[PDB]
Design a protein that fits this description.
Elements: H1 18-21, E1 27-28, E2 41-47, H2 53-59, E3 65-67, E4 74-76, E5 79-84, E6 90-95, H3 109-120, E7 141-146, E8 149-153, H4 161-164, H5 178-181, H6 194-199, H7 204-212, E9 232-236, E10 244-249, E11 255-256, E12 268-274, H8 277-285, E13 291-292, H9 302-308, H10 310-313, E14 315-322, E15 326-332, H11 339-345, H12 348-356, H13 360-367, H14 388-392, H15 399-408, E16 429-435, H16 439-453, E17 458-464, H17 466-474, E18 480-485, H18 510-517, H19 528-541, H20 546-563, E19 566-567, E20 575-580, E21 583-584, E22 591-592, E23 608-609
Parallel strand pairs: 1-11, 2-12, 14-22, 16-17, 16-18
Antiparallel strand pairs: 3-4, 5-6, 6-8, 7-8, 9-10, 10-12, 13-20, 14-20, 15-18, 15-19, 21-23
PDB class: sugar binding protein
Keywords: pectin-binding protein, chemotaxis, sugar binding protein
Assembly: monomeric
Length: 610
């Protein structure tokens, strides 16, 4: 009885009063910076007519949980609260009594149970269940406990599930209104076949996708009648050839600010549909967008143009933090077929010397324009996974120490070109594979080649397109592979740099990874420290409590630090973004990435115009 609404809703005479449209207890959103005011149209942009995730990452997945701003944990979001059983298998969600869909009808456990059992877990709909809802490849039992309580029962520990529910790919539970969607489902509509010709499809899964959609389908944004719990609703749909998309506030949105205003603050979102980046950067520098945090930061050429024109365009450039720990890390192949090299590749002090012979300040200045600070492979300080050794050991150039180590390891005989040689002959030479489309990585290797020559080590660059790059890796035909190190902020989601579990990307040895993934039937058996990390990883995946998962995974990171298997160059540059100076409550320190649906991580329903 203390809630208010956007003035524009006063004119809609088929709406109940705002306190009746809200849940009994709406979710209260604390603003990023200040309490807001109603009004305005958020101007943003999509590139082409297959950029529908741009809508999703603008308005935000409305999942059962939501990431915190530092993406260190999640909180109840659509769910009022939830419990986790001691064995980490059972997840029980309480829902917000009185919450309604965009069409004013009830949002209840019926919708979640329909979404899971009749859509997600239906083998005609999804012959392969989306991995978001699996553990060890197995699905949960999903049950209605009462109108506002739903239970997920997995057959194995699954502590990641609340985090999964905060990602775009884990939002199916709240995406399907049973009332609307059941019309297109044969378990509920005996005459669903009559719907096929209407929708212009030939089977009921295609019909469901057409009318009710999926996370990333164009049909999610192509109709006005598909109910949702989104902060804004499609009004001018994202059509195959439309030039703009318009969305308008959901009168039944289920959140208020601390003063009782039903969110969102902003009345409408208008998406310009634009043909290419050249046109998008121009409009952005002209100040035609109130927010752009998806497309411009992918193109390293955009930042100078954006900064130059801030005052002209009335906008502020800000920098988001990529999840990757390293922009261009050296993956050293412990199972290189070069037998003479392998006897050195497997020695910690050899890898240490190579890191000490690198000048990361030069790499940063020359190949990354000074925007990418030296770093190894470890999580960042703002991550709960931070390990100082894993992040910072062996970062500083010490050519004398590198040469002293290499002398000590017996690589003292120089050939006629000045390079070190193995004790029984042969130049100390490492083949590094690189994708030429990663131009900054190629230049980084060129700088490393010049630096390592000062330590008597030859780096031979082998640039190719993607397919040959991956062919060589999977064939175990490389000494070094250069590519990102994940783990700056997403170490458990993407642990490939710390334990050899990714079949294509854990390039300290994909033969080790093949062994792990095949249960020892294929590949090459890893060394003891890696087998131990693999055992710790399996235990971490099966952990029953947060504190147990934390201690197990920290052990993996410590062993990875002690081994020093992969050599980082520089952490990624910030991702350049902009918001108009009038747009308030944008979290300018938020990370970047698809699992967090950025920029919607920042809660666009509490952005507002001053």
């Amino acid at each position: 009885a203390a809630f208010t609404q956007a003035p524009m809703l006063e004119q809609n005479k088929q709406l109940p009063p705002v306190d009746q449209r809200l849940p009994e207890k709406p979710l209260v959103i604390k603003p990023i910076a200040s309490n807001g005011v109603y009004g305005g149209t958020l101007r943003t942009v999509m590139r082409g007519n297959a950029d529908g995730n741009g809508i999703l990452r603008t308005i935000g997945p409305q999942g059962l949980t939501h990431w915190t701003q530092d993406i260190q944990t999640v909180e109840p979001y659509v769910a009022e609260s939830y419990t986790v059983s001691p064995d980490a298998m059972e997840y029980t969600f309480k829902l917000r009594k009185g919450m309604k869909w965009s069409d004013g009808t009830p949002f209840t456990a019926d919708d979640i149970v329909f979404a899971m059992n009749d859509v997600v877990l239906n083998k005609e709909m999804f012959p392969q269940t989306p991995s978001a809802y699996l553990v060890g490849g197995k699905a949960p039992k999903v049950s209605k406990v009462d109108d506002y309580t739903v239970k997920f029962e997995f057959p194995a520990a699954n502590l990641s599930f609340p985090e999964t529910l905060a990602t775009p790919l884990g939002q199916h539970p709240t995406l399907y209104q049973k009332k609307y969607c059941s019309q297109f489902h044969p378990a509920y509509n005996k005459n669903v076949q009559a719907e096929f010709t209407k929708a212009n499809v030939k089977d009921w899964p295609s019909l469901m996708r057409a009318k009710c959609s999926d996370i990333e389908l164009p049909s999610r944004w192509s109709s006005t009648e598909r109910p949702s719990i989104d902060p804004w609703l499609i009004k001018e749909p994202y059509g195959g050839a439309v030039t703009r998309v318009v969305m308008e506030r959901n009168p039944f949105y289920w959140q208020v600010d601390p003063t009782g205003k039903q969110l969102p603050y902003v009345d409408r979102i208008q998406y310009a549909v634009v043909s290419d980046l050249q046109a998008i950067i121009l409009a952005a520098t002209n100040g035609q967008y109130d927010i752009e945090a998806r497309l411009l930061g992918s193109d390293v050429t955009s930042r100078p143009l954006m900064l130059k024109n801030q005052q002209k365009g009335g906008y502020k450039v800000f920098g988001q933090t990529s999840a990757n720990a390293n922009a261009a890390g050296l993956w050293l192949n412990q199972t290189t077929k070069n037998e003479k090299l392998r006897k050195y590749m497997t020695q910690h002090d050899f890898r240490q010397a190579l890191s000490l012979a690198m000048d990361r300040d030069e790499i940063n200045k020359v190949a990354w324009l000074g925007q990418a600070a030296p770093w190894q492979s470890g999580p960042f300080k703002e991550s709960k996974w931070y390990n100082e050794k894993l992040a910072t050991q062996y970062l500083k150039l010490d050519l004398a120490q590198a040469n002293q180590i290499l002398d000590r390891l017996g690589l003292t005989k120089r050939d006629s070109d000045g390079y070190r040689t193995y004790p029984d002959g042969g130049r100390v030479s490492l083949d590094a594979i690189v994708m030429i489309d990663r131009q900054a990585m190629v230049q980084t290797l060129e700088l490393i080649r010049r630096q390592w020559q000062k330590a008597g080590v030859e780096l031979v660059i082998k640039g190719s397109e993607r397919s040959l790059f991956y062919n060589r890796a999977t064939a175990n035909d490389y000494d070094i592979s250069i590519d990102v190190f994940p783990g700056g902020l997403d170490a458990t989601l993407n642990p490939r740099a710390y334990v050899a579990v990714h079949p294509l990307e854990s390039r300290m040895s994909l033969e080790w990874a093949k062994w792990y993934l095949s249960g020892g039937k294929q590949g090459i058996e890893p060394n003891e420290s890696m087998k131990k990390r693999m055992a710790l990883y399996d235990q971490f995946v099966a952990a029953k409590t947060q504190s147990q998962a934390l201690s197990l995974f920290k052990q993996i990171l410590q062993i990875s630090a002690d081994e020093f298997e992969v050599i980082g160059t520089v952490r990624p540059a910030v991702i350049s973004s902009l918001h108009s100076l009038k747009l308030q409550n944008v979290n300018e320190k938020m990370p970047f990435g698809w699992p967090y649906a950025t920029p919607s991580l920042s809660l666009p329903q509490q952005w507002y115009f001053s």
